[PDB]
Amino acid sequence: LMVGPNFRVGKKIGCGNFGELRLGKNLYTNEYVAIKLEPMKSRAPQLHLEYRFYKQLGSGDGIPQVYYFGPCGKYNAMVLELLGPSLEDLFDLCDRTFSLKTVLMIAIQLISRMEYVHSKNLIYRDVKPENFLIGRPGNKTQQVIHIIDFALAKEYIDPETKKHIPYREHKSLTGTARYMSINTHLGKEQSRRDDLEALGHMFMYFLRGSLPWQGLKADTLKERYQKIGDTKRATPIEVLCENFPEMATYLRYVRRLDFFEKPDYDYLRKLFTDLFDRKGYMFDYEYDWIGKQ
Ligand SMILES: Nc1nccc(-c2c(-c3ccc(F)cc3)ncn2[C@H]2CC[C@H](O)CC2)n1
Ligand SMILES: [Cl-]
């Protein structure tokens, strides 16, 4: 099982949106890589569109490099830069709470990461801790929070018109229920606001250890999502964000954005960098997980 001229496929490492994950090696360069495989027989093929989105991003900071897309036996394969553990993995290592300092270092970076994605005319639509990975150990980039898995992304600027996509409502909801915006639950088309709201939910998950809508079950997926959305609507921001005034300010701001509105990314960063400085924290990448296995 080679992918392309030069990538050897090795052991299983994980799962993502519309594909499975192996360690690989570029034999020509003696460098390890990650390989996502999607069965060619897939009823709902997502890997090639994902490849196109990575190419549209180029590389910015925290964007994994993509090396190859092509067939591999009965699979389509995409070869990516190998990264380190996800924020969910690191959260588990840290007993499922992060310090304010760690959350702020994450948040400052991910506001910028999302601004970059939005600058390439994409919305992300799959915010979750499993999709944010540090770099590799002893790598120049173990400190950097990367974004992966663009299978659910969407162009929000139509390349034909150069205009923002129109507002509309949808039957099917995109993304992870725990983090999605309130408007996502209501079947609205997602836009830039929704990515930033989902980040806010994720930040609060890290600070609190959990979100209050986590334990909800139902007989249908639709009912489950409805109950989660209902709890999000029913939970005041001042309650969710007790003890974190700046998070309350962030969440209120993003929840109140118009569908078409460009977020004030500078404002949101400044909420958090002003807080960071006021607390006497140093931006030294000494996250909670440093010095753990
Ligand atoms: N360590 C690591 N390096 C780069 C990408 C991936 C990864 C990928 C991936 C995406 C597209 C590709 F072409 C290859 C891999 N999808 C999920 N992940 C990780 C998510 C976190 C999980 O605990 C392990 C797998 N993994
Ligand atoms: Cl290997």
Secondary structure of residue 13 in the 3-state scheme: strand
Centroid of chain to Cα 3 = 27
Rounded to the nearest whole angstrom, what is the distance from the C-alpha of residue 58 to the centroid of ligand 2? 26
Is-contact 165 172, C-beta < 8 A? Answer: no
Closest ligand to C-alpha of residue 47 is: 1
Closest CA to 47 of 18, 13, 9: 18
Annotated binding-site residues read 13-21, 36
- In angstroms, rounded to a whole number, what is the distance separating the alpha carbons of residues 35 and 189? 31
DSSP state of 189: P
Asked if 126 is an active-site residue, the reply is yes
Exposure string over 111-138, b if 16+ CB within 10 A, otherwise e: bbbbbbbbeeebbbbbbbbbbbbbbeee
Mutate to test the pocket of ligand 1, among 12, 13, 93, 149 (most ligand atoms within 8 A of CB): 13
Phi and psi angles of residue 170, each rounded to the nearest 5 degrees, phi first: -125, 150
36 Cβ below 6 A of ligand 1: yes
Structure tokens belonging to residue 4: 């392309």
**In this structure, are residues 52 and 32 in contact, taking their beta carbons and an 8 Å threshold?**
no
**Cα 271 from Cα 103, distance rounded (Å):** 13
Ligand number, closest to the Cα atom of 31: 2
Asked if residue 237 lies in contact with residue 211, where contact means CB atoms within 8 angstroms, the answer is no
Rounded Cα distance, 18 and 193, in Å: 25
Is the beta carbon of 12 within 6 A of some atom in ligand 1?
no
Q: How many residues does the chain have?
A: 293
The DSSP result for 144-176, as a single string, is: SEEE---TT-EESB-TTT-SBPPP-B-SSPPS-
List phi, psi (to 5°) of 119.
-65, -20
Q: Structure resolution in Å?
A: 1.5
Q: What domains are defined for the chain?
A: 1-83 (3.30.200.20), 84-293 (1.10.510.10)
Annotated binding site for ATP: 13-21, 36
Judge if the beta carbon of residue 89 lies within 6 A of ligand 1: yes
Which of 92, 126, 158, 264 is flagged as catalytic? 126
